[PDB]
């Protein structure tokens, strides 16, 4: 996350961190329930071995509530392509169920049609993660969050060199230099409705991080609600 701010205690409790064999975080996820983590298919390619950590705020200091969970099954969308990043969705089943706590709690999955007309049309959503705090910099040692405007889809296309399919959407600012970055991928984009947070996006890709005139691209969760349900059975 470039810009934005650190999440306070209990502020981003649906954030998961996927950690590699060096126990380093390379990607995020969104807690959907005690057994299920929502993430990006492409994150599957960015590690030889991984587990899921929940509850981390400062990754240089255990603080209580933190747990590591082994992944039992990876459900990857098999239409994912690294060429377009279309269908950038996967769901992880944990071996052992999460114990919800302060800083550990699911985001709500929305109803499809309703989310189309009423979440996707709010002004802002919130993206969160441990990723780099500058395009060329280092991962954050602290969970950050950033409020990001939804961006109309013709504006999204206009600005973008790569295709924007119906399974993606853009959010962010035009001149303000704040957006997701590397290490934030797979992580949550959520939208507040009457103080309940629903997951509306998966951190997917950007042309750099927080470049002027460019927006973060997210997998559009409302496009995949049936596939998500089925994956959670």
């Amino acid at each position: 996350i470039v810009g934005g701010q650190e999440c306070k205690d209990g502020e981003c409790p649906w954030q998961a961190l996927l950690i590699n064999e060096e126990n380093e975080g390379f990607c995020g996820g969104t807690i959907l329930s005690e057994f299920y983590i929502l993430t990006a298919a492409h994150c599957l390619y960015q590690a030889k071995r991984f587990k899921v950590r929940v509850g981390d705020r400062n990754t240089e200091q255990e603080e209580g509530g933190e747990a590591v969970h082994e992944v039992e099954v990876v459900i990857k969308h098999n239409r994912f392509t690294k060429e377009t990043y279309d269908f950038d969705i996967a769901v992880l089943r944990l071996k052992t169920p999460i114990t919800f706590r302060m800083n550990v709690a699911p985001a709500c999955l929305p109803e499809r049609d309703w989310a189309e007309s009423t979440l996707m049309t709010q002004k802002t959503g919130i993206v969160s993660g441990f990723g780099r705090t500058h395009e060329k910099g280092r991962q954050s040692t602290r969970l950050k969050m950033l409020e990001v405007p939804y961006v109309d889809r013709n504006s999204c296309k206009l600005s973008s060199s790569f295709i924007i399919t119906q399974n993606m959407f853009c959010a962010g600012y035009d001149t303000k230099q704040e957006d997701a970055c590397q290490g934030d991928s797979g992580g949550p984009h959520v939208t507040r409705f009457k103080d309940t947070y629903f997951v509306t996006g998966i951190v997917s890709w950007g042309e750099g991080c927080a470049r002027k005139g460019k927006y973060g691209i997210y997998t559009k969760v409302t496009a995949f609600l049936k596939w998500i349900d089925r994956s959670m059975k």
Binding site: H42, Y85, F162, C181, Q182, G183, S185, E207, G208
Partner: peptide, 5 residues
Amino acid sequence: XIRLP
């Protein structure tokens, strides 16, 4: 993440 033309 970072996808550059």
